[PDB]
Amino acid sequence: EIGRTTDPVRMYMREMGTVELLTREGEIDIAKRIEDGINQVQCSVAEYPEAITYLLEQY
DNA sequence: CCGCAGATTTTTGCGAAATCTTTGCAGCCAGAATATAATGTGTGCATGACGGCGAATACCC
Incomplete structure (x- = not known):
């Protein structure tokens, strides 16, 4: 606080x-919303073809 | 004072090895990968000069 402090x-x-x-x-709830976000980004990558082509190349 | 012997000088030759780069090896080492039970707390505070001095807010008149 503001107490003339100089110690981090x-x-x-x-x-x-x-x-x-x-x-x-x-x-668990926070990790659930994290999982929802990562599923959203996975779907976004899903709608992108070229990243999937790269993944199939590595497969 | 001159020509050869001792001493000194001239010349050709072979072995040896070390070094530089490349390849195989072993000790060193770095990151990547796996899912044990544990969240408002610790903590050092170590402590008895003396004089000067401006800066920083307080408070009476």
Whole structure:
């Protein structure tokens, strides 16, 4: 905080204090939205032919 | 003071090996790959000169 501080440790703790801890199912929900995003990007790559041609070349 | 002997000088020759690059090997080493249970906490704070001094906010009049 603004306490005439000059230690990066202190305000790093300040930064980490803003975000609240997660639960077991919270991690699963966040990973689920991550999986939705990666499936979206996989579909986007899917609609692109040339990347698939390159993948088939390596196969 | 001159020509040959001892000493010194001239010339041709072979073995040896080391070095530079390439190839095979072994110790060194780097990244890539796998899914054990663990999230607001630690932490060092070590501490008794003395004089000068401006800068930085506070507070009375």
